[PDB]
Amino acid sequence: VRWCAVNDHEASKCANFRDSMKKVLPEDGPRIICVKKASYLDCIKAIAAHEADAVTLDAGLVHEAGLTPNNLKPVVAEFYGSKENPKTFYYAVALVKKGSNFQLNELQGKKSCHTGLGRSAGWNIPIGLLYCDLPEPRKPLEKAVASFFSGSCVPCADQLCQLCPGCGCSSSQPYFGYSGAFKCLKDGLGDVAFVKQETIFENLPSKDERDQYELLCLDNTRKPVDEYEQCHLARVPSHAVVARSVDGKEDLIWELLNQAQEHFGKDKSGDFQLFSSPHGKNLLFKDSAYGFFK
Ligand SMILES: [Fe+3]
Protein backbone atom coordinates (compact mmCIF):
# COMPACT_ATOMS: atom_id res chain seq x y z
CA VAL A 1 0.00 0.00 0.00
CA ARG A 2 1.26 3.26 -1.44
CA TRP A 3 -0.63 5.97 0.47
CA CYS A 4 -1.03 9.30 -1.36
CA ALA A 5 0.24 12.20 0.70
CA VAL A 6 -1.00 15.63 -0.27
CA ASN A 7 2.22 17.62 -0.20
CA ASP A 8 5.04 18.25 2.29
CA HIS A 9 3.43 18.19 5.79
CA GLU A 10 1.34 15.14 4.93
CA ALA A 11 4.39 13.53 3.34
CA SER A 12 6.10 13.91 6.72
CA LYS A 13 3.31 12.20 8.65
CA CYS A 14 3.17 9.51 6.18
CA ALA A 15 6.91 9.00 6.71
CA ASN A 16 6.11 8.54 10.41
CA PHE A 17 3.17 6.26 9.66
CA ARG A 18 5.54 4.22 7.50
CA ASP A 19 8.43 3.38 9.90
CA SER A 20 6.34 2.71 13.06
CA MET A 21 4.19 0.17 11.26
CA LYS A 22 7.44 -1.35 10.06
CA LYS A 23 8.15 -1.88 13.74
CA VAL A 24 4.77 -3.53 14.38
CA LEU A 25 3.29 -5.19 11.22
CA PRO A 26 4.46 -8.84 10.64
CA GLU A 27 7.52 -9.37 8.58
CA ASP A 28 5.51 -7.82 5.86
CA GLY A 29 2.08 -6.54 6.79
CA PRO A 30 1.30 -4.03 3.97
CA ARG A 31 4.25 -1.80 4.83
CA ILE A 32 3.37 1.40 2.95
CA ILE A 33 5.01 3.64 0.34
CA CYS A 34 4.35 7.37 0.72
CA VAL A 35 3.39 8.81 -2.67
CA LYS A 36 3.16 12.65 -2.57
CA LYS A 37 0.81 14.69 -4.88
CA ALA A 38 0.29 18.44 -4.27
CA SER A 39 -3.59 18.11 -4.50
CA TYR A 40 -6.28 15.52 -3.69
CA LEU A 41 -7.76 14.94 -7.18
CA ASP A 42 -4.08 14.73 -8.11
CA CYS A 43 -4.14 11.77 -5.77
CA ILE A 44 -7.38 10.65 -7.40
CA LYS A 45 -5.83 10.50 -10.87
CA ALA A 46 -2.80 8.84 -9.27
CA ILE A 47 -4.86 6.00 -7.80
CA ALA A 48 -6.83 5.49 -11.00
CA ALA A 49 -3.61 5.79 -12.99
CA HIS A 50 -2.41 3.04 -10.66
CA GLU A 51 0.25 5.43 -9.35
CA ALA A 52 -1.20 5.28 -5.83
CA ASP A 53 -3.53 3.04 -3.82
CA ALA A 54 -5.34 5.27 -1.30
CA VAL A 55 -6.24 8.64 0.18
CA THR A 56 -8.76 9.97 2.69
CA LEU A 57 -11.25 12.34 1.08
CA ASP A 58 -14.06 14.44 2.37
CA ALA A 59 -17.32 12.99 1.62
CA GLY A 60 -18.15 15.61 -1.00
CA LEU A 61 -14.78 14.54 -2.50
CA VAL A 62 -15.59 10.89 -2.13
CA HIS A 63 -18.44 11.69 -4.34
CA GLU A 64 -16.73 13.38 -7.26
CA ALA A 65 -14.07 10.74 -7.01
CA GLY A 66 -16.77 8.17 -8.05
CA LEU A 67 -17.07 10.20 -11.27
CA THR A 68 -15.80 9.02 -14.67
CA PRO A 69 -15.98 5.65 -16.40
CA ASN A 70 -14.54 3.87 -13.56
CA ASN A 71 -13.38 5.88 -10.69
CA LEU A 72 -12.75 4.98 -7.09
CA LYS A 73 -14.77 3.79 -4.11
CA PRO A 74 -14.91 4.07 -0.30
CA VAL A 75 -13.35 1.19 1.49
CA VAL A 76 -12.64 2.54 4.95
CA ALA A 77 -14.53 5.21 6.87
CA GLU A 78 -13.64 7.04 10.08
CA PHE A 79 -15.94 7.29 13.05
CA TYR A 80 -15.94 10.30 15.07
CA GLY A 81 -17.59 10.25 18.58
CA SER A 82 -16.06 7.80 20.85
CA LYS A 83 -15.03 4.25 21.20
CA GLU A 84 -18.09 4.13 23.40
CA ASN A 85 -20.60 5.83 20.97
CA PRO A 86 -18.75 5.87 17.54
CA LYS A 87 -20.82 7.88 15.05
CA THR A 88 -20.31 8.08 11.31
CA PHE A 89 -20.89 11.79 10.69
CA TYR A 90 -20.52 15.31 11.79
CA TYR A 91 -22.08 18.69 11.37
CA ALA A 92 -21.49 21.64 9.19
CA VAL A 93 -21.65 24.88 11.14
CA ALA A 94 -21.22 28.56 10.27
CA LEU A 95 -18.78 29.96 12.81
CA VAL A 96 -18.59 33.65 13.29
CA LYS A 97 -17.38 36.30 15.67
CA LYS A 98 -19.50 37.36 18.59
CA GLY A 99 -21.08 40.80 17.99
CA SER A 100 -21.12 41.04 14.16
CA ASN A 101 -24.88 41.40 14.30
CA PHE A 102 -25.39 39.64 11.07
CA GLN A 103 -27.40 36.46 10.69
CA LEU A 104 -27.45 33.66 8.02
CA ASN A 105 -29.69 36.19 6.37
CA GLU A 106 -27.19 38.91 5.71
CA LEU A 107 -24.07 36.87 4.59
CA GLN A 108 -24.84 39.29 1.90
CA GLY A 109 -21.81 41.43 1.10
CA LYS A 110 -19.59 39.58 3.66
CA LYS A 111 -16.21 37.84 3.12
CA SER A 112 -16.02 34.18 4.01
CA CYS A 113 -13.81 31.26 4.79
CA HIS A 114 -13.85 27.78 3.54
CA THR A 115 -12.17 24.50 3.84
CA GLY A 116 -12.12 23.83 0.13
CA LEU A 117 -13.99 23.60 -3.09
CA GLY A 118 -16.47 20.76 -3.12
CA ARG A 119 -16.18 19.63 0.54
CA SER A 120 -19.21 18.98 2.77
CA ALA A 121 -19.13 21.58 5.54
CA GLY A 122 -16.71 23.91 3.64
CA TRP A 123 -18.70 24.39 0.39
CA ASN A 124 -21.51 21.89 -0.52
CA ILE A 125 -23.68 22.53 2.42
CA PRO A 126 -23.36 26.47 2.82
CA ILE A 127 -23.76 27.07 -0.98
CA GLY A 128 -26.65 24.66 -1.14
CA LEU A 129 -28.20 26.78 1.66
CA LEU A 130 -27.24 29.99 -0.11
CA TYR A 131 -28.08 29.91 -3.79
CA CYS A 132 -31.39 30.73 -5.30
CA ASP A 133 -30.39 34.05 -3.70
CA LEU A 134 -27.05 33.99 -5.44
CA PRO A 135 -26.85 36.29 -8.39
CA GLU A 136 -28.92 34.87 -11.43
CA PRO A 137 -25.99 34.67 -13.67
CA ARG A 138 -25.68 31.58 -11.51
CA LYS A 139 -24.00 30.02 -14.56
CA PRO A 140 -20.91 28.88 -12.78
CA LEU A 141 -21.63 28.32 -9.16
CA GLU A 142 -18.12 29.52 -8.34
CA LYS A 143 -18.96 32.73 -10.31
CA ALA A 144 -22.23 33.61 -8.60
CA VAL A 145 -20.53 32.86 -5.28
CA ALA A 146 -17.70 35.31 -6.39
CA SER A 147 -20.33 37.58 -7.34
CA PHE A 148 -22.16 37.13 -3.98
CA PHE A 149 -19.65 37.42 -1.04
CA SER A 150 -16.86 40.04 -1.54
CA GLY A 151 -13.78 38.27 -0.31
CA SER A 152 -13.29 34.56 0.21
CA CYS A 153 -10.78 31.90 0.77
CA VAL A 154 -11.88 28.81 -1.02
CA PRO A 155 -8.86 26.59 -1.27
CA CYS A 156 -8.21 24.31 -4.26
CA ALA A 157 -10.45 26.81 -6.44
CA ASP A 158 -10.03 28.54 -9.74
CA GLN A 159 -11.70 34.68 -8.45
CA LEU A 160 -12.34 33.80 -4.70
CA CYS A 161 -8.76 33.43 -3.42
CA GLN A 162 -8.79 36.97 -2.21
CA LEU A 163 -7.91 35.89 1.32
CA CYS A 164 -5.37 33.25 0.25
CA PRO A 165 -4.07 34.41 -3.16
CA GLY A 166 -3.64 31.27 -5.20
CA CYS A 167 -6.17 29.11 -3.34
CA GLY A 168 -3.70 26.31 -2.40
CA CYS A 169 -3.95 23.06 -0.44
CA SER A 170 -2.16 22.68 3.03
CA SER A 171 1.04 24.70 2.79
CA SER A 172 -1.59 27.43 2.52
CA GLN A 173 -1.58 29.36 5.78
CA PRO A 174 -4.61 31.58 6.81
CA TYR A 175 -6.50 29.39 4.44
CA PHE A 176 -6.84 25.71 3.47
CA GLY A 177 -8.51 22.94 5.73
CA TYR A 178 -10.90 23.27 8.78
CA SER A 179 -8.05 24.44 10.70
CA GLY A 180 -7.21 27.10 8.22
CA ALA A 181 -10.74 28.29 7.53
CA PHE A 182 -10.98 28.97 11.23
CA LYS A 183 -7.65 30.83 10.96
CA CYS A 184 -9.16 32.79 8.17
CA LEU A 185 -11.92 33.77 10.71
CA LYS A 186 -9.44 34.77 13.39
CA ASP A 187 -8.84 37.85 11.16
CA GLY A 188 -9.96 38.40 7.54
CA LEU A 189 -13.32 36.70 7.21
CA GLY A 190 -16.48 38.63 7.50
CA ASP A 191 -16.92 36.39 10.53
CA VAL A 192 -17.95 33.51 8.27
CA ALA A 193 -15.99 30.31 8.56
CA PHE A 194 -17.72 27.22 7.34
CA VAL A 195 -16.36 24.37 9.36
CA LYS A 196 -17.10 21.22 11.23
CA GLN A 197 -18.42 21.52 14.76
CA GLU A 198 -15.38 20.15 16.53
CA THR A 199 -13.05 22.75 15.00
CA ILE A 200 -13.13 25.54 17.68
CA PHE A 201 -12.35 23.02 20.46
CA GLU A 202 -9.50 21.65 18.44
CA ASN A 203 -7.95 25.03 18.09
CA LEU A 204 -9.13 26.50 21.44
CA PRO A 205 -8.94 24.81 24.87
CA SER A 206 -9.70 28.28 26.41
CA LYS A 207 -13.36 28.90 27.12
CA ASP A 208 -12.78 32.67 27.33
CA GLU A 209 -11.49 32.94 23.80
CA ARG A 210 -14.11 30.50 22.71
CA ASP A 211 -16.78 32.77 24.20
CA GLN A 212 -15.50 35.22 21.47
CA TYR A 213 -17.30 33.33 18.66
CA GLU A 214 -20.80 32.09 17.87
CA LEU A 215 -22.74 29.96 15.44
CA LEU A 216 -25.19 30.97 12.71
CA CYS A 217 -28.52 28.96 12.56
CA LEU A 218 -31.16 28.38 10.01
CA ASP A 219 -33.70 29.53 12.67
CA ASN A 220 -32.22 32.74 11.92
CA THR A 221 -30.31 33.05 15.04
CA ARG A 222 -26.83 33.06 16.59
CA LYS A 223 -25.83 30.69 19.32
CA PRO A 224 -23.04 29.61 21.68
CA VAL A 225 -20.57 27.28 19.95
CA ASP A 226 -21.31 24.66 22.63
CA GLU A 227 -24.85 23.91 21.43
CA TYR A 228 -24.23 23.07 17.80
CA GLU A 229 -26.72 20.18 17.75
CA GLN A 230 -29.23 23.03 17.85
CA CYS A 231 -27.38 25.35 15.54
CA HIS A 232 -25.76 23.36 12.80
CA LEU A 233 -26.17 24.02 9.10
CA ALA A 234 -26.47 20.26 8.34
CA ARG A 235 -25.33 16.66 8.95
CA VAL A 236 -22.56 15.21 6.80
CA PRO A 237 -21.49 11.59 6.05
CA SER A 238 -17.90 11.39 7.08
CA HIS A 239 -14.42 11.00 5.61
CA ALA A 240 -13.55 7.68 3.98
CA VAL A 241 -10.54 6.26 2.19
CA VAL A 242 -11.03 5.43 -1.37
CA ALA A 243 -9.49 2.79 -3.35
CA ARG A 244 -10.11 1.88 -6.87
CA SER A 245 -13.20 -0.13 -7.60
CA VAL A 246 -11.49 -2.92 -9.49
CA ASP A 247 -8.07 -4.09 -8.68
CA GLY A 248 -7.57 -1.73 -5.72
CA LYS A 249 -5.95 -3.32 -2.60
CA GLU A 250 -9.18 -3.11 -0.56
CA ASP A 251 -8.65 -5.99 1.95
CA LEU A 252 -4.96 -4.92 2.25
CA ILE A 253 -5.87 -1.34 2.67
CA TRP A 254 -8.28 -2.28 5.46
CA GLU A 255 -5.53 -4.57 6.76
CA LEU A 256 -3.22 -1.83 7.12
CA LEU A 257 -5.64 0.65 8.59
CA ASN A 258 -7.18 -1.79 11.09
CA GLN A 259 -3.82 -2.83 12.72
CA ALA A 260 -2.46 0.70 12.62
CA GLN A 261 -5.44 1.78 14.78
CA GLU A 262 -4.69 -0.86 17.53
CA HIS A 263 -1.26 0.50 17.76
CA PHE A 264 -1.48 4.24 17.22
CA GLY A 265 -5.32 4.57 17.60
CA LYS A 266 -7.17 7.13 19.74
CA ASP A 267 -5.80 6.70 23.30
CA LYS A 268 -2.02 6.14 22.96
CA SER A 269 1.31 7.91 22.59
CA GLY A 270 3.27 5.56 20.30
CA ASP A 271 5.64 8.20 19.00
CA PHE A 272 3.46 7.81 15.97
CA GLN A 273 -0.21 8.38 16.71
CA LEU A 274 -2.66 8.10 13.92
CA PHE A 275 -5.12 10.95 14.56
CA SER A 276 -2.66 13.84 15.34
CA SER A 277 0.85 14.96 14.37
CA PRO A 278 3.55 17.66 14.87
CA HIS A 279 3.54 18.58 11.10
CA GLY A 280 0.26 20.21 11.78
CA LYS A 281 -3.44 19.54 12.03
CA ASN A 282 -5.55 17.10 9.97
CA LEU A 283 -2.97 15.16 7.93
CA LEU A 284 -3.84 11.76 6.32
CA PHE A 285 -6.92 11.39 8.58
CA LYS A 286 -8.94 13.86 10.63
CA ASP A 287 -7.78 14.64 14.16
CA SER A 288 -11.37 14.39 15.32
CA ALA A 289 -11.46 10.76 14.18
CA TYR A 290 -11.55 7.92 16.65
CA GLY A 291 -11.03 5.02 14.40
CA PHE A 292 -12.11 3.19 11.36
CA PHE A 293 -15.21 1.24 10.45
CA LYS A 294 -15.19 -0.69 7.14
FE1 LIG B 1 -15.25 17.26 5.90
UniProtKB/Swiss-Prot annotation:
It is found in: Secreted. Expressed by the liver and secreted in plasma. Fe(3+) 1 binds at D58, Y90, Y178, H239. Residues 1-294 form the Transferrin-like domain. Hydrogencarbonate 1 binds at T115, R119, A121, G122. Belongs to the transferrin family. This is Serotransferrin.
